[PDB]
Design a binder for these strands. Sequence first.
RNA 1: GAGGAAUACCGAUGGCGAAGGCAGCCUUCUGGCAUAAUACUGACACUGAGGCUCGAAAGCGUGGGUAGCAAACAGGAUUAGAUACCCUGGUAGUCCACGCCGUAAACGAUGUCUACUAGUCGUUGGGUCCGGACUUAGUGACGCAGCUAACGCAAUAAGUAGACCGCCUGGGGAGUACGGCCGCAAGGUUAAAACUCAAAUGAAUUGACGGGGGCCCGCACAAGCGGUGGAGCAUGUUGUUUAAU
Lengths: 153, 115, 57
Amino acid sequence: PRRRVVATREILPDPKFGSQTIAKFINHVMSHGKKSTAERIVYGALETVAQKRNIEDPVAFFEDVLENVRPMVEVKARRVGGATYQVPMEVRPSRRTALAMRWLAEAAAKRSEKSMALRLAGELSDASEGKGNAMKKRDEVHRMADANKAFSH
Amino acid sequence: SVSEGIAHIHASFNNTIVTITDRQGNALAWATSGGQGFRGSRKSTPFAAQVAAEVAGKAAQEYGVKNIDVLVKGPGPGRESAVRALGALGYKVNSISDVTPIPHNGCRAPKKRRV
Amino acid sequence: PAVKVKENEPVDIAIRRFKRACEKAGVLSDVRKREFYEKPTQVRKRKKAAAVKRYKK
RNA sequence: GAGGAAUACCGAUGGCGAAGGCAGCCUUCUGGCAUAAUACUGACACUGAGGCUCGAAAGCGUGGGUAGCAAACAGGAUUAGAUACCCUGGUAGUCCACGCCGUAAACGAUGUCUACUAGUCGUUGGGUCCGGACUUAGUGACGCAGCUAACGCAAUAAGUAGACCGCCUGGGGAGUACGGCCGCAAGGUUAAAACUCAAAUGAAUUGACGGGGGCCCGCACAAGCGGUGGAGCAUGUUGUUUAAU
């Protein structure tokens, strides 16, 4: 807003892992307020990748892929006397997680697998090694930040 | 070949040129902000001067210069960044001098811009 | 405006001292005052306004 | 190496000059001013129509010079256009000598000279006393009384008076025409009328507005989520069509 910084809402964890990170990703996958549909999409993706990779605890795998997708430097528009400068700045960690989750969902939304859960699992697997449209978007953002790398205002 | 050198930091409002010569005045290497990929507004920044000084120093370091004294001239922004670049590139600075041409009320300046 | 860097001191402190010396020597002010030619009437106006401000404060 | 021009710092509501003006340094020629005391002349004064002199910059003539800057001019951009603003060049001019021109918001928009009228604080050049005190001639900032339509001025008056000179008499037409005079020219100077309009103005007040400044708020933007604009249909309106829609 314009005056204060709101106290953030509490997010209850996912029922089947007890992790607020997976709960927040379920929210990012959600549409029209359908928690059950979003939860089954995300859980199908997670069980698919877990059964394919033979990993007992996939929350750590999700943390790994999330930190791999997270950018560190984002380009912000600044105004100095009528000049629009694309100054690269750091990303605060909350925005880091939000951007990573949004990029993962929007990249998984455009793939070619049959089910959305299969699409999301394939995208998680791909970003685990370092490929996929989430990785391309992160690389694009880093590319623009380094392309400027000349305004430290 | 030469161990003592002079780094001239000619810095204008538009561009900054970093030349490195011997004590006598014969140029060994040079770099410019406009010759390092930056053009227009980016070219007249301290960062472009930093990379120009880095390139010029790394090109002239093969000659054998380790001792160098800098000669800053002009009002541009990269006049301070180029010296830090040279210092961090491993050059042993001898002295920092600011030899900029200052007329004693000589030739008439160009007219004031009406912008 | 010449600063002779001593032994073992960082180039950052050396350039801070050089910036101080160059600011003392009035280098950037003089190179600014030659950027465009200034008409005697505008010089006189600027000086008179400066004197009025300096006297008031 | 050649050349031309300007003289950073000092530098200062600092200085000098009647004004216009006048900045490196040195010599020569030369004006005024400020100051202390003594001596001297003895009203020799003030102002001043016509007149004469000087008079920024631009401009003109002849002869030199020509670095930078730069009218004009050329190209590049911007733009709807862009004979501009910005950019790159660039000639007259700016510089010198000798002459013309005679005009500037040539301003303090305040003629010159004289006397008197609370005060406070700076600064420049002298002087006299004991770092100050005082007194002078300038140069500033404040501030009474007084004045003023108000703003404001206020011993550097726009106060209180006096001397002489200049000028004004609604706004345009018009500082124009015609005629003189001056000028190489550009033009300057002196200076109407018809006609036309009931205004044109000054200062201040309240608002509003500003591609003025400062501070602040609103899903105003930014950060996001979902739409509308494309399809079919519902509904409303326009247009059209109808006897009417």
